[PDB]
Write a protein that binds this ligand. Structure first.
Ligand SMILES: *[C@@H]1O[C@H](CO)[C@@H](O[C@@H]2O[C@H](CO)[C@@H](O)[C@H](O)[C@H]2NC(C)=O)[C@H](O)[C@H]1NC(C)=O
Ligand SMILES: *[C@@H]1O[C@H](CO)[C@@H](O[C@@H]2O[C@H](CO)[C@@H](O)[C@H](O)[C@H]2NC(C)=O)[C@H](O)[C@H]1NC(C)=O
Ligand SMILES: *[C@@H]1O[C@H](CO)[C@@H](O)[C@H](O)[C@H]1NC(C)=O
Ligand SMILES: *[C@@H]1O[C@H](CO)[C@@H](O)[C@H](O)[C@H]1NC(C)=O
Ligand SMILES: *[C@@H]1O[C@H](CO)[C@@H](O)[C@H](O)[C@H]1NC(C)=O
Ligand SMILES: *[C@@H]1O[C@H](CO)[C@@H](O)[C@H](O)[C@H]1NC(C)=O
Ligand SMILES: *[C@@H]1O[C@H](CO)[C@@H](O)[C@H](O)[C@H]1NC(C)=O
Ligand SMILES: *[C@@H]1O[C@H](CO)[C@@H](O)[C@H](O)[C@H]1NC(C)=O
Ligand SMILES: *[C@@H]1O[C@H](CO)[C@@H](O)[C@H](O)[C@H]1NC(C)=O
Ligand SMILES: *[C@@H]1O[C@H](CO)[C@@H](O)[C@H](O)[C@H]1NC(C)=O
Ligand SMILES: *[C@@H]1O[C@H](CO)[C@@H](O)[C@H](O)[C@H]1NC(C)=O
Lengths: 244, 366
């Protein structure tokens, strides 16, 4: 039901600094006022994070996404290998109500999208879903900063999240904030490349203000500090400087 | 024991270390989170009605707890036959998900549903491979599906050139061509309807009544499992050296209540050198503390074989509450060095004779 588009929009992709953001809880273990050294797959300190103003991007090990979001125009996510009926494709949709997740051989078009009819009902991202097994529904997820980490380990999709109110204009702030685990999916797919949904006004799609940050993860060793309450308050990257 | 370890028939005055004491665990406890998200079986077994046998209703069951105890122990089911796995251990064994096939067949057709079976239902309606794992449950539905005027809502496939492959539904309404004369989609000289409707009535005899049958098949593809039976959770006992199995993690110790403040997602804590030191019960969400069961060495205080034969016993670093032949013995003293049995504490003070520890020591007078 989704068709071609003539206005070949291009996103003004710039670069900026990652600073010390993107730290999550690696395990469900409580610890109190200690310094624990852990070797895992993180976002290296002071890295090169890409900024966008629906491009195709690789997944690699894992993907860090951030948005100083206004009005939550961005809605969903697509994951998979080929994003067609030939391979299982994971789909996530978050609207103002109960959010939904599927894994089906969705046959996406060249420009899949939701579309909003202004009382709203428009959903033509895919065209067919014939063979598929798993489905899922859960509570709603979401000017203000929202940070998400997406990982996939041994048949286990993993979503970590964090939210903060922010007042800085453009760049990432010089702050520290650990990321709590949010959702796990014990389903095995070969996800290696993903997408990003948009809520365009269809009645002529009007989607021009789509700014968000994307970064990639690598394996390395960190040193985390736990306070009395067992919340991560500081971290040190081992392979950064001689001092580190 | 002192003579044996020292390897002599004479013992000089002193204190000697002979063996070790370790408290033993009493019983086992296991706790698991609340049983919830029951698999949707009642809505299938005891629904309004069932689908036809050639159009059998297929359901996929995943992400739920599959309680089979009430299913197996239900006495309202006419036939409950499991081929692949033992019904009694179904609460233990589990595959990643389940398939349900529900339909209505005549009473005589119940035995037709089995691996390696041939028949109208067994060939033209549904087929089961000889490697099938799962169960078949059949029950009477004469009071529900059979109609006094004749139940014609259920049909079975009777005319087909070839038998159905296992796990396949044929809904094609092509008119079977009995002879060599092709028919233009209708019956005729050598053509008839492949599907035949039932004539179920309450007046029908044994085996002629409508029976609702559900076949459950278990499949365990390499994807992580979602369907498993309920797990029994025992009760918890505090202040007793026991061995526990909290939500899959096992350990031995005394289990007390603790005031630590966890965080709404982290389950259990640990202190240093990777030793478990706190757990949260999945049932009540309370922060409990764990302490290893007591142990220590034992020492024998003697004044010398030449003098006497009575001795005292010291349990090192052991609380003077669970000591237990000297379960009671003489008066029992508690000191920073442990617990002392066979000696009495006086208020005097002399030169030290047999060093005990923490500033105290013993001598012979008793
Ligand atoms: C650990 O968490 C506790 C609980 O929130 C913090 O103690 C609170 O501090 C605020 C600010 O003074 C008080 O209003 C609350 O009454 C305190 N709650 C208590 C004592 O239960 C504590 O500050 C935290 N530790 C840190 C931040 O290091
Ligand atoms: C586990 O199930 C019980 C259901 O019995 C939940 O609530 C219990 O409700 C009874 C009656 O209202 C109370 O007497 C119990 O104290 C409740 N249990 C607890 C642990 O508070 C119980 O909440 C469920 N467990 C969780 C973690 O939600
Ligand atoms: C990020 O990459 C761009 C080009 O790839 C480069 O010009 C820029 O210097 C990089 N940023 C940092 C902080 O090195
Ligand atoms: C959107 O909201 C509606 C209304 O509750 C509901 O279908 C669900 O929560 C959402 N559906 C989709 C497809 O996002
Ligand atoms: C699913 O795939 C099988 C091949 O493995 C095919 O025979 C079947 O028709 C497919 N089902 C659907 C609904 O597309
Ligand atoms: C952004 O998210 C934070 C996290 O809860 C919330 O406090 C804040 O109100 C949100 N921003 C707006 C404009 O609502
Ligand atoms: C992912 O790819 C590997 C190698 O090509 C394959 O063995 C595996 O089965 C694939 N995963 C799934 C879920 O099919
Ligand atoms: C094309 O789309 C971009 C953003 O999607 C917008 O900025 C631009 O004005 C559009 N151009 C036309 C001709 O529609
Ligand atoms: C029939 O199914 C209903 C579904 O709610 C259930 O309540 C009832 O106990 C069932 N009857 C049995 C198991 O005999
Ligand atoms: C015990 O001691 C006394 C005096 O010290 C000595 O005469 C005697 O032989 C000793 N007996 C033994 C068995 O050592
Ligand atoms: C030693 O003296 C204290 C205080 O005078 C008294 O409480 C204690 O009972 C005395 N010890 C004995 C063995 O009587």
């Amino acid at each position: 039901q989704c068709v071609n588009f003539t206005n070949r929009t291009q996103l003004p992709s710039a670069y900026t600094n990652s600073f010390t953001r993107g730290v999550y809880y690696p395990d469900k273990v409580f610890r109190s006022s200690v310094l624990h050294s852990t070797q895992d797959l993180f976002l290296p300190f002071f890295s090169n994070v890409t900024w966008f103003h629906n491009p195709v991007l690789p997944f690699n090990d894992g993907v860090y996404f951030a948005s100083t979001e206004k009005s939550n125009i961005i809605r969903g996510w697509i994951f998979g290998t080929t994003l067609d009926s030939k391979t299982q494709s994971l789909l996530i949709v978050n609207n103002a109500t109960n959010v939904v997740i599927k894994v089906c051989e969705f046959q996406f078009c060249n420009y899949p999208f939701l579309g909003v009819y202004y009382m709203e009902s428009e959903f033509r991202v895919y065209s067919s879903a014939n063979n598929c097994t798993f489905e899922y529904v859960s509570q709603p997820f979401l000017k203000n900063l929202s940070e998400f980490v997406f990982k996939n380990i041994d048949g286990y999709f993993k979503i970590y999240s964090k939210h903060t109110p922010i007042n800085l204009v453009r760049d990432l702030p010089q702050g520290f904030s650990a990321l709590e685990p949010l959702v796990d999916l014990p389903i095995g797919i070969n996800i290696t490349r993903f997408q990003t949904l948009l809520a365009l006004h269809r009645s002529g799609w009007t989607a021009g203000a789509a700014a968000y940050y994307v970064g990639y993860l690598q394996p390395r060793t960190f040193l985390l500090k736990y306070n009395e309450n067992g919340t991560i308050t500081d971290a040190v990257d081992c392979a950064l400087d001689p001092l580190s | 024991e002192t003579k044996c370890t020292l390897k002599s028939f004479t013992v000089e005055k002193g204190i000697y270390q002979t063996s070790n004491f370790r408290v033993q665990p009493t019983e086992s406890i296991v706790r698991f989170p609340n049983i919830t998200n029951l698999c949707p079986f009642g809505e299938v077994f005891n629904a309004t009605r069932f689908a036809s046998v050639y159009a059998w209703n297929r359901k996929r069951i995943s992400n739920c707890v599959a309680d089979y105890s009430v299913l197996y122990n239900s006495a309202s089911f006419s036939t409950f036959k499991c081929y692949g796995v033992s019904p009694t251990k179904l609460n233990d064994l589990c595959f990643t998900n389940v398939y349900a096939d529900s339909f209505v067949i005549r009473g005589d057709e119940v035995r037709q549903i089995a691996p390696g079976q041939t028949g109208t239902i067994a060939d033209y309606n549904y087929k089961l491979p000889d490697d099938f794992t799962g169960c078949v449950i059949a029950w009477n539905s004469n009071n529900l599906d059979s109609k006094v005027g004749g139940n014609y809502n259920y049909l079975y496939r009777l005319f087909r050139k070839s038998n159905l492959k296992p796990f396949e539904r044929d809904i094609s309404t092509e008119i079977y061509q009995a002879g060599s004369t092709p028919c233009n989609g209708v019956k005729g000289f050598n053509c008839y309807f492949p599907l035949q409707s039932y004539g179920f009535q309450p007046t029908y005899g044994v085996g002629y009544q409508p029976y609702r049958v559900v076949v459950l098949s278990f499949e365990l593809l390499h994807a992580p499992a979602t369907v498993c039976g309920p797990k029994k959770s025992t009760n918890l006992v505090k202040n007793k050296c026991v061995n526990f199995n909290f939500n899959g993690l096992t350990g031995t110790g005394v289990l007390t209540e603790s005031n630590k403040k966890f965080l709404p997602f982290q389950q259990f804590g640990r202190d240093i050198a990777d030793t478990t030191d706190a757990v949260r019960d999945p049932q009540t969400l309370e922060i409990l503390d764990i302490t290893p069961c007591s142990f220590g060495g034992v020492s024998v205080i003697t004044p010398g074989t030449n003098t006497s034969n009575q001795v005292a016993v010291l349990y090192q670093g052991v609380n003077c509450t669970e000591v237990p032949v000297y379960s009671t013995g003489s008066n029992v003293f508690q000191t920073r060095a442990g617990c002392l049995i066979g000696a009495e504490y006086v208020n005097n003070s002399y030169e030290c004779d047999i060093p005990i520890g923490a500033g105290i020591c013993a001598s012979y007078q008793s």
